[PDB]
Design a protein around this ligand. Structure first.
Ligand SMILES: O=C1C=CC2=C(C1)Oc1cc(O)ccc1[C@@H]2c1ccc(NC(=S)NCCO[C@H]2O[C@H](CO)[C@H](O)[C@H](O)[C@H]2O)cc1C(=O)O
Ligand SMILES: O=C1C=CC2=C(C1)Oc1cc(O)ccc1[C@H]2c1ccc(NC(=S)NCCO[C@H]2O[C@H](CO)[C@H](O)[C@H](O)[C@H]2O)cc1C(=O)O
Ligand SMILES: [Ca+2]
Ligand SMILES: [Ca+2]
Ligand SMILES: [Ca+2]
Ligand SMILES: [Ca+2]
Lengths: 121, 121, 121, 121
C-alpha cells in the first residue's frame, strides 16, 4: 500500500504518514483493531468510535484524518474518497485534548492513494 | 459503489449482495457500525470482531465473506484483494452456528469491484 | 469494463456510451486501432491523431470525449482523470465539421469509471 | 503515475521502468505518440503498431511489455490487467531483432500499478 502502520490512541498529535496529498487526489483507508480511551473496562473503541454501551460526544474517540489541520472522518475506513484540501496526511485518534493520558493500544491502518489529481483537459 | 447495504447479525445465512464474482477479480470492502452477538452488555462486536474485554475464538463473531461456500476474512474492511473462487459474494456475521438467536443489530457495508479478471497476454 | 465498443470515424455526433458522469468522477480510457479521415491511402489516424506524414490542425482527427458539449483530449487513452462537468460521456472522432463523409473505420475503445465522486467529510 | 517516461524506438533492449512486478499485481498502461521503424515515409508506428497500409508481421513494431523475459501485448494501452509472472517491467518497441538501427522517435508511456497481489484469505 502507500502507507501502513499503527496509530497509537495515546498520540495526541496523531501519526504522520509522510503522504503529501493534493486537492483532487482520491484515497482509500482501512483500519483494524482496538484501543482504550480510558481506564474503565467499558472504555473501548474501534476506529468507528466508542462501543455503543458508553457513548461519547460527536466524533470523539474515533479515527480521523488530519490534512493541513482540517479534520475528516475515517472510522473503520473509506473507499475512493476525494481529498478536498492540500496537505500532509496525519492519522489521529480523536480524543478530547488533554485526555490522552488514559489511552492505550493502537489501530493497524492501511492507506492507498487511489489516484493523483489530473483533470480531463 | 457496486453494493452497499446492511448485514444483519442474526442472519445465519448472511446477506446476498448479488455481486457475481469470478476468480481473479479484485474487490474492496469497508464495514461500519456495531452489533450484538449476545444479550450481555459486553457482547458487542465491530466488524473486526468482539470487543476484546470478552474475547471469542478466532474468526468468531467477525464479518466474513462467503463465496462458493468458502469463508474469507473481511472485518472492518479489505483493500484490493483478489477473489480466489467463482461465486456470488455473501456477507456474513460469522457467529457460532446455532447461536444467532441472541444476536441483534447490523453492519453498514460497502463493496467495490476494483477490477474484473483479465490477464496480460 | 464499464463500457466497451467501437467509435465510428464517420459519426459527426460521436458515439454515446450511456455512462452518465458527474463532476468529480474519475475515469480511464484506452483506444485501439485505426480509422480513415479521408479516402486517400495516407489519411490514416490512430486515436492520438493523424499519422505525422500528413499532419492536420491541433486536435483534428483525434479521439476526444464530449461531456456537457465540452471537448476533452483522450487520444490513445487516459488514466484516472477527473471529470470536470456533469454529462453523458460521448466519444467523438474530432474531424473538421462537414468532413465526416469521407471517413471510415472505427476505434475499439474501453472506458472504466474508476470512482464516483465522494469527498472526505 | 507509478512510472512515466519515454520508450525509444531505437532501443533494442527497451526501457527499464524499475517497477518490480509480482504475479497477481494488476497494472494499467497508456502510450502516446509516434515513432519510425524505418526511414521510408510510410514506416510510422503508433503503440498499436505500424500504420495498416504497410503492415508488418504480427506484434512487430508494437509497444510490448517484457516481464521475466516473456512478452505481453500493450499497444496503445491496457486497463487493470493481471500480471502473470514475476519480474521488472521492461517496455519495448518490438521491432525485428537487429533492425533497430533505422528507428527513431519515442512513445510517451504512463504506467500505474493498480494493486499489489493480496488474496482474500
Ligand atoms: O544484423 C542483422 C539484422 C537483421 C537481419 C540480419 C542481421 O540477418 C538476416 C539473415 C537472413 O537470412 C534473413 C534476415 C536477416 C535480418 C532481417 C532483415 C530485415 C528484415 N525485414 C525487412 S527487410 N523488411 C520488412 C519492412 O521493413 C521495415 O520493417 C521491419 C520490421 O518488419 C524493420 O523494422 C525494418 O527496419 C523496416 O525498414 C528482417 C530480418 C529478420 O531477421 O527476419
Ligand atoms: O463534394 C464536396 C467535396 C468537398 C467539399 C465540399 C463538397 O464542400 C465544401 C464547402 C465548404 O464551405 C468548405 C469546404 C468544402 C469541401 C472540402 C472538404 C475538405 C477539404 N480539406 C481540408 S479542410 N483539409 C485538407 C486535408 O483533408 C483531410 O483532412 C481533413 C481534416 O483536416 C478532413 O478530414 C478531410 O475529409 C480529409 O480529406 C477541403 C474542401 C474544399 O473544397 O475546400
Ligand atoms: Ca482518554
Ligand atoms: Ca450469538
Ligand atoms: Ca474527413
Ligand atoms: Ca526498424
Amino acid at each position: 500500500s502507500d502507507w501502513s502502520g499503527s496509530v497509537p490512541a495515546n498520540a495526541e498529535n496523531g501519526k504522520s504518514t509522510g503522504l503529501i496529498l493534493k486537492q483532487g487526489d482520491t484515497i482509500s483507508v482501512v483500519a483494524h483493531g482496538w484501543v482504550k480511551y480510558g481506564r474503565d473496562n467499558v472504555e473501548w473503541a474501534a476506529p468507528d468510535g466508542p462501543v455503543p454501551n458508553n457513548p461519547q460526544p460527536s466524533s470523539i474517540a474515533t479515527l480521523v484524518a488530519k490534512i493541513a489541520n482540517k479534520k475528516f472522518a475515517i472510522g473503520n475506513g473509506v473507499l475512493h474518497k476525494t481529498v478536498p484540501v492540500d496537505g500532509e496526511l496525519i492519522l489521529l485518534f480523536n480524543d478530547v485534548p488533554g485526555t490522552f493520558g488514559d489511552n492505550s493500544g493502537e489501530f493497524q491502518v492501511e492507506v492507498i492513494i487511489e489516484s493523483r489529481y489530473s483533470p480531463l483537459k
